[PDB]
Design a protein around this ligand. Structure first.
Ligand code: 49Y
Ligand SMILES: *[C@@H]1O[C@H](CO[C@@H]2O[C@@H](C)[C@@H](O)[C@@H](O)[C@@H]2O)[C@@H](O[C@@H]2O[C@H](CO)[C@@H](O)[C@H](O)[C@H]2NC(C)=O)[C@H](O)[C@H]1NC(C)=O
Ligand code: NAG
Ligand code: NAG
Lengths: 239, 96, 202, 268
């Protein structure tokens, strides 16, 4: 019994319309929207008992809800607000008590978008010293120069995501921590066997998914419109 | 909806000057929101007691109001009932 | 706050056992569910208890529920590094879809990883596109080394970070440093208190 | 012979936020309990209303009801949301529930629900179900209520074991009141020309009232309905349409178990 949420991550500006969609194939009559905020549980916003209905939940203010069909329950924010920065969770269930939760969606509502900036991705190649002293090869990825802090860094080997032997900073760091809203920087690690790295037919790639502006947001400055995009870096194995 | 059936009757055999209790029995009505008064000469008797509301097998409501009264030659006693099922309120007068 | 959890957070050396507590005033209490939530992810169910006095288990997780006392626990035997996560108590007030769920604010677990065989070193890695640039990777230190942030604002040092080569049952903390300044990997971690037997290559 | 114990609940939901729920309880024609919406707690209307339950039992039983009441209210409200706009306030639910006791340790128990005055649902066996005539839309409400296994076991326990047990205890503790005898009193009156025999104050309800010319039971008699008095006695009257002038020599014979043998004869 599955449930999906799109988008999974959104940067937005005060006053903008934001729409969070949830979709489920289980033919579940009932669907629910929560928001999770540090130091509270999940609190229910709107829910639906079937197509055509939407009911006010426990903290409905600022949110309108829309069930156009059995499949879709969408949460709509007509006028976004910094206070609506949260992690939003959709659920469905049938007539019994279990609610099957979605993966969650992250929203950040900023005052202005003037600082939004995608990252610069560098990939650094294993030390010969490490290789020869450990029999292991650690790649290091750096993403830098970015704002706000909404990046998903993923590791790919031969077009297949890898998690084993990865460790990403649990939060990004601030490049000018004594400045109003500075840019961020995040590092990650992927450690492999020295033979793996030595294989010249393995392609390694650090990939940063940056969440920024939508193509339909006004861009007022001269620099490239800092859109939601992918920045990456890659290297091949070597002997 | 259903129309109230009112029934005014005395507990003891009526006798002038001699105190007694006068019953107004309202029955067979739906929905149960009702206003029941008991009148002496068209005027609201102040100390009137209600049983708790209940209902029969046919799911219809009933309730018994009563009050103390001394019946006389020249005094009329009635039970006035307001219900959404009636345009105007039905008054039923007592009769010996 | 009809669902109170305790402790608000707790730290434990890998291998150790721990118990989480959940107390509630919710009425009625048809069922209690313990969710697990990795930092960044969403909600995985671990168990749901439904009887007056109830016991459950899911591998290394066991749990109780006493409805007279309105109290549940969650025992994790022999913790692993993947247990680092937030644990959330949830009480359903009906055995049907008519119910509302009431969420605790969770308990934040952190499990310290056991580094059986340390070999601390500081190596220098080279940028694929541009040999001019580089980073310094301080690695293979044990859990009782903390990593202190940069002296200069120009230098960046990230924090300790354990990776798990499941392939080879092997873990290792690491931290990264870089800068443009008269900057090098001998100097990079100076303002951090690093073991006296650290490997520093050429 | 066969007493019936009846828990009558009546609840009214005016709109989305105003509801109220009031119950009263009967054993035959005598009230034993009363539970007002604005009372947190159930009220004995008889010294023996607790039955042969210890306090511990009563307090747990009552507490089950306290929870149910609150729970009942929200669920209806949520059920109206699930159905809407097919169904809308004002809504009147009424429950009738209890057991009827028989010789042996034998009893049937019931739990019948009514919606806007029409009997539609019952608990039966192990689950809820609609009765003949009910609207099909109830199938969703009923499918939901039947999802709640916890409520099913409880209700099954109340109907199968608790009611007959409790009511068997009640009948022991209430013997005195339940087996009370009160003597009727009678008076005659008339109107347009209808003779009228008033009988009042009698308990229990069975009674025989007949107009008579001497030893010949005048067959045109009409028994009225049993109306109650406030003190838990009964009132009833019998009328006879007669040609004016023919009143002479008519009597009103009233029989009652109160009256050991000697009847009440009233002459015009
Ligand atoms: C539009 C709709 C039309 C159709 C509408 C269809 C309507 C059908 C409604 C019927 C169910 C409503 C309650 C169930 C409720 O829905 C659950 O909420 C609740 C609560 O359920 C939750 O919590 C429970 C724990 O207590 C369980 O864990 C349960 O699993 C959980 O779900 N469950 C109950 O409380 C079980 C009790 C249910 C029924 C008891 C019989 C009630 C009939 C009596 C006549 C009423 C009041 C009289 C009181 C005074 C008598 C005292 C004298 C002594 C007597 C011994
Ligand atoms: C309780 O008794 C029922 C049967 O009793 C009927 O329903 C009650 C709620 C009450 O109204 C009685 O007076 C009724 O006569 C049992 O239900 C049976 O269960 C078996 C197996 O569980 C099932 O296969 C049968 O079909 C059911 N019988 C009927 C007539 O529906 C139930 O098991 C009893 N529950 C408990 C907890 O004692
Ligand atoms: C609900 O009903 C009551 C009376 O029946 C009325 O006083 C009140 O205005 C209503 N409440 C709302 C919120 O509409
Ligand atoms: C009836 O009682 C409930 C529960 O105490 C209360 O919240 C509700 O408003 C009451 N309704 C009325 C009309 O008194």
């Amino acid at each position: 019994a599955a449930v999906t949420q799109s988008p999974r991550n959104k940067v937005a500006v005060t006053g903008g319309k934001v729409t969070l969609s949830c979709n489920q194939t289980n033919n579940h009559n009932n669907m629910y929207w929560y928001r999770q905020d540090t130091g509270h549980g999940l609190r229910l916003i709107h829910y639906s008992y079937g197509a055509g209905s939407t009911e006010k939940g426990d903290i409905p203010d600022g949110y309108k809800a829309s069930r156009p069909s059995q499949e879709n329950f969408s949460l709509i924010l007509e006028l976004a607000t910094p206070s609506q920065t949260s992690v939003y969770f959709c659920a469905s269930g049938d007539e019994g008590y279990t609610q099957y939760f979605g993966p969650g969606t992250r929203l950040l509502v900023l005052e202005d978008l003037r600082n939004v900036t995608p990252p610069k991705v560098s990939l650094f190649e294993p030390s010969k010293a490490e290789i020869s002293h450990t029999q292991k090869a650690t790649l290091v990825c750096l993403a830098t120069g970015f704002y706000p802090d909404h990046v998903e860094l993923s590791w790919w080997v031969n077009g297949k995501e890898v998690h084993s032997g990865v460790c990403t900073d649990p939060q990004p760091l601030k490049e000018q921590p004594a400045l109003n809203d500075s840019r961020y920087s995040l590092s990650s690690r992927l450690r492999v066997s020295a033979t793996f790295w030595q294989n010249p037919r393995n392609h390694f790639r650090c990939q940063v998914q940056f969440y920024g502006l939508s193509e339909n947001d006004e861009w007022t400055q001269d620099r490239a419109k800092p859109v939601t995009q992918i920045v990456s870096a890659e290297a091949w194995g070597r002997a | 909806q259903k129309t109230p059936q009112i029934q005014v009757y005395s507990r003891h055999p009526p006798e002038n000057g001699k105190p007694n209790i006068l019953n107004c029995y309202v029955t067979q009505f739906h929905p149960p929101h009702i206003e029941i008064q008991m009148l002496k000469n068209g005027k609201k008797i102040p100390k009137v007691e209600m049983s708790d509301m209940s209902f029969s097998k046919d799911w219809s409501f009933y309730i018994l109001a009563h009050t103390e009264f001394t019946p006389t030659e020249t005094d009329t006693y009635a039970c006035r009932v307001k219900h959404a099922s009636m345009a105007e309120p039905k008054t039923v007068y007592w009769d010996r | 706050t009809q669902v109170e959890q305790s402790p608000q957070s707790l730290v434990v050396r890998q291998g150790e056992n721990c118990v989480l507590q959940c107390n509630y005033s919710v009425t009625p209490d048809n069922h209690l569910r313990w969710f697990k939530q990795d930092t960044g992810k969403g909600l995985v169910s671990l168990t749901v208890l439904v009887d007056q006095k109830d016991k459950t288990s899911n591998g290394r997780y066991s749990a109780t529920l006493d409805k007279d006392a309105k109290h549940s626990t969650l025992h994790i035997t022999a913790t692993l590094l993947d247990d680092t996560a937030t644990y959330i108590c949830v009480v359903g007030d009906r055995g049907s879809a008519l119910g509302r769920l009431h969420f605790g604010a969770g308990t934040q677990l952190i499990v310290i990883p056991d580094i059986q065989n340390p070999d601390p070193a500081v190596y220098q890695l080279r940028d694929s596109k541009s040999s001019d640039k580089s980073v310094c990777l301080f690695t293979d230190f044990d859990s009782q080394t903390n990593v202190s942030q940069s002296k200069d604002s120009d230098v960046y040092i990230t924090d300790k970070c354990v990776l798990d080569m499941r392939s080879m049952d092997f873990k290792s903390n690491s931290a990264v440093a870089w800068s443009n300044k008269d900057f090098a990997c001998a100097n990079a971690f100076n303002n951090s208190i690093i073991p006296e037997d650290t490997f520093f290559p050429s | 012979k066969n007493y019936t114990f009846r828990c009558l609940q009546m609840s009214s939901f005016a709109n989305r936020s105003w509801s109220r729920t009031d119950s009263v309880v009967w054993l035959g024609d005598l009230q034993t309990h009363r539970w007002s919406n604005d009372s947190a707690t159930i009220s004995f209307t008889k010294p023996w209303s607790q039955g042969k339950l210890s306090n511990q039992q009563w307090e747990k039983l009552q507490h089950m009801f306290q929870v149910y009441r609150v729970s009942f209210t929200r669920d209806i409200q949520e059920l109206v949301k699930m159905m809407s706009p097919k169904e809308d306030y004002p809504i009147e639910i009424q429950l009738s529930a209890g057991c009827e006791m028989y010789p042996g340790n034998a009893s049937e128990s019931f739990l019948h629900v009514a919606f806007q005055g029409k009997y539609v649902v019952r608990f039966w066996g192990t689950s809820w179900q609609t009765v003949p005539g009910a609207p099909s839309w109830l199938d969703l409400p009923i499918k939901v209520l039947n999802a709640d296994q916890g409520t099913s076991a409880t209700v099954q326990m109340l109907l199968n074991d608790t009611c007959p047990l409790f009511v068997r205890g009640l009948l022991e503790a209430g013997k005195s009141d339940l087996e009370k005898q009160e003597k009727p009193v009678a008076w005659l009156s008339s109107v347009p020309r209808q003779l009228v025999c008033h009988v009042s104050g009698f308990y229990p309800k069975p009674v025989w009232v007949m107009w008579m010319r001497g030893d010949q039971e005048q067959q045109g008699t009409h028994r009225g309905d049993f109306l109650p008095n406030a003190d838990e006695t009964w009132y009833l009257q019998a009328t006879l349409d007669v040609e004016a002038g023919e009143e002479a020599g008519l009597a009103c014979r009233v029989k009652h178990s109160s009256l050991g043998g000697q009847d009440i004869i009233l002459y015009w």
